[PDB]
Amino acid sequence: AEAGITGTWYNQLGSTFIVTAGADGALTGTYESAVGNAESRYVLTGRYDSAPATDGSGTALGWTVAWKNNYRNAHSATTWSGQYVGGAEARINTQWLLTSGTTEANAWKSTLVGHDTFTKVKP
Amino acid sequence: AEAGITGTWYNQLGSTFIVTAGADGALTGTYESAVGNAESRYVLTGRYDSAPATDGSGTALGWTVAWKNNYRNAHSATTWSGQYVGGAEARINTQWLLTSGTTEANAWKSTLVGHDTFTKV
Amino acid sequence: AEAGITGTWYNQLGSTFIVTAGADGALTGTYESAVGNAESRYVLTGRYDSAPATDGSGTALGWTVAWKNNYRNAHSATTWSGQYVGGAEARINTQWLLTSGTTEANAWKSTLVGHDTFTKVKP
Amino acid sequence: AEAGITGTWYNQLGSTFIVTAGADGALTGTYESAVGNAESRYVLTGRYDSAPATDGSGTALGWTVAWKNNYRNAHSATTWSGQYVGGAEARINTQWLLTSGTTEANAWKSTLVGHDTFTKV
Numbered sequence: 001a002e003a004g005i006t007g008t009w010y011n012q013l014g015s016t017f018i019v020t021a022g023a024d025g026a027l028t029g030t031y032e033s034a035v036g037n038a039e040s041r042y043v044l045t046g047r048y049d050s051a052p053a054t055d056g057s058g059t060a061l062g063w064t065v066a067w068k069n070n071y072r073n074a075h076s077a078t079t080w081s082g083q084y085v086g087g088a089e090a091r092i093n094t095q096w097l098l099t100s101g102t103t104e105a106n107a108w109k110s111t112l113v114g115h116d117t118f119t120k121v122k123p
Numbered sequence: 124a125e126a127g128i129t130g131t132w133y134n135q136l137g138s139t140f141i142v143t144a145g146a147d148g149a150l151t152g153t154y155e156s157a158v159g160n161a162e163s164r165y166v167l168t169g170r171y172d173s174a175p176a177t178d179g180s181g182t183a184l185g186w187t188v189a190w191k192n193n194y195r196n197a198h199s200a201t202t203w204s205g206q207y208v209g210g211a212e213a214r215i216n217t218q219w220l221l222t223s224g225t226t227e228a229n230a231w232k233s234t235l236v237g238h239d240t241f242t243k244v
Numbered sequence: 245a246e247a248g249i250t251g252t253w254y255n256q257l258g259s260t261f262i263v264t265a266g267a268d269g270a271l272t273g274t275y276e277s278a279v280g281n282a283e284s285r286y287v288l289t290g291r292y293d294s295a296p297a298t299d300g301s302g303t304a305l306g307w308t309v310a311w312k313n314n315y316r317n318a319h320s321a322t323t324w325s326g327q328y329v330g331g332a333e334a335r336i337n338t339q340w341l342l343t344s345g346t347t348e349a350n351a352w353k354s355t356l357v358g359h360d361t362f363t364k365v366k367p
Numbered sequence: 368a369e370a371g372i373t374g375t376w377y378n379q380l381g382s383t384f385i386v387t388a389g390a391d392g393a394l395t396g397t398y399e400s401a402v403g404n405a406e407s408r409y410v411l412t413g414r415y416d417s418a419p420a421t422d423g424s425g426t427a428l429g430w431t432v433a434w435k436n437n438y439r440n441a442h443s444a445t446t447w448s449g450q451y452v453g454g455a456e457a458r459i460n461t462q463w464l465l466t467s468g469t470t471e472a473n474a475w476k477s478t479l480v481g482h483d484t485f486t487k488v
């Protein structure tokens with residue numbers, strides 16, 4: 001649900017995710033990573049599927065971060081795809097793809113794959 | 124580097140991707156899939172890394188589509204991560220993750236992975 | 245190391261992995277899954293990279309299971325790619341790809357991706 | 368279904384895959400990669416699901432290569448998961464995972480994902 005998703009979240013690496021979910025299925029915010037060629041905050045945009053099902057199914061969603069801001073430019077972008085599971089201990093479980101810009105010759109090694117679990121800090 | 128990302132692209136399944144790239148890294152537009160539990164257009168939002176880097180590399184980017192619109196709601200979302208290579212034949216080469224909302228019991232099989240190549244042809 | 249890998253392992257879903265690592269970099273055994281279109285044991289074969297590094301790096305390895313035996317035929321195969329981290333609480337952390345045989349038309353939805361963590365039962 | 372899997376296949380990077388399929392689901396052979404920290408041949412072992420199923424589907428299979436031989440040891444392993452489609456032009460369409468051994472600190476970036484298509488041409 002938008003209200004359930006809106007908030008501050010942290011994952012197992014110690015990275016920060018601040019997001020706002022709008023009535024139209026939109027997600028906007030900033031992300032701070034604890035690892036990598038990154039520093040300060042980066043803007044993020046995504047979408048969430050606003051009418052889930054009733055039942056004890058998760059809400060599917062996804063968002064993107066291009067790793068460029070006023071301080072660093074890493075020439076990469078990461079996308080996270082997953083589901084939001086609410087309750088008293090709400091979580092967002094995801095799998096992600098991190099693509100770096102390469103020459104055609106090294107494109108075979110341009111994408112890393114992983115998984116992150118986020119915990120909401122409420123309050 | 125960045126540049127002719129704006130436009131109408133098509134992939135090997137016959138899907139249509141219409142996007143506008145803003146000067147500060149944002150991507151907005153609509154997507155229509157030729158397959159799956161989907162019909163008509165859906166809203167997409169993403170980001171690209173303008174630099175990009177001299178050693179003729181691609182420009183990294185990504186975007187998301189939540190499969191809900193006024194015709195269907197498939198309770199899923201797809202994210203595409205890849206890079207744009209411009210030139211005579213411009214291409215956007217991606218890998219995607221399609222997650223459906225499931226119950227805990229079925230969470231082990233909630234995500235499909237695949238790859239799509241887009242051209243303006 | 246071969247001795248460190250050889251044994252019985254279980255993952256978060258409650259599935260069983262029995263393996264033997266040979267001196268030549270080989271892995272052979274049986275796998276029993278707690279979920280899916282599966283029943284009884286299935287044969288597995290894989291390889292492990294025998295001379296890791298000294299250091300506190302993991303040993304990379306991978307194995308495959310075709311889901312066909314005398315009782316069921318699911319027309320699928322799963323491959324697990326990951327690393328073995330030994331110590332007192334040894335673990336094998338992986339990401340997997342499960343491909344089902346399809347017609348050309350539905351090949352776009354033939355592969356599922358996930359991650360499993362295995363814990364060794366010693367003794 | 369299964370059948371002409373045995374043989375010498377090549378993918379879009381120019382790598383060579385030589386395999387033998389046994390009648391009870393086993394796959395054995397050698398692999399030579401045209402890219403990366405690798406040279407000469409490496410041992411591979413895998414499995415395929417013989418049934419396969421009537422609705423002209425592919426045969427599911429997978430195999431593993433640990434990148435260590437008498438010339439190099441790259442401390443990594445790759446697994447390919449996909450399906451074989453025979454016929455006039457037979458193809459093995461796969462997605463792979465390449466994991467390198469890292470320390471805990473770098474475990475978040477230990478795995479690359481990609482896709483390869485093999486032909487006997």
Ligand SMILES: O=C(O)CCCC[C@@H]1SC[C@@H]2NC(=O)N[C@@H]21
Pocket residue numbers: 011013015033034035036037038067074076077078096098114116475
């Ligand atoms: O190094 C880069 O290219 C930019 C930083 C990438 C950080 C990644 S995104 C996935 C994983 N989850 C995190 O919170 N950080 C790393």
Ligand SMILES: O=C(O)CCCC[C@@H]1SC[C@@H]2NC(=O)N[C@@H]21
Pocket residue numbers: 134136138155156157158159160161190197199201219221237239352
């Ligand atoms: O069935 C669904 O869940 C919604 C439609 C999904 C269509 C997918 S997204 C990845 C692949 N590329 C496309 O153009 N369409 C399919």
Ligand SMILES: O=C(O)CCCC[C@@H]1SC[C@@H]2NC(=O)N[C@@H]21
Pocket residue numbers: 231255257259277278279280281282311318320321322340342358360
């Ligand atoms: O349903 C099938 O096609 C065969 C069973 C698949 C079981 C999978 S493999 C990955 C995940 N890990 C497990 O232990 N079980 C599921």
Ligand SMILES: O=C(O)CCCC[C@@H]1SC[C@@H]2NC(=O)N[C@@H]21
Pocket residue numbers: 108378380382399400401402403404405434441443445463465481483
């Ligand atoms: O550099 C390494 O770690 C060892 C060589 C890896 C070569 C990879 S495996 C997937 C892709 N397909 C190939 O034919 N070669 C590359």
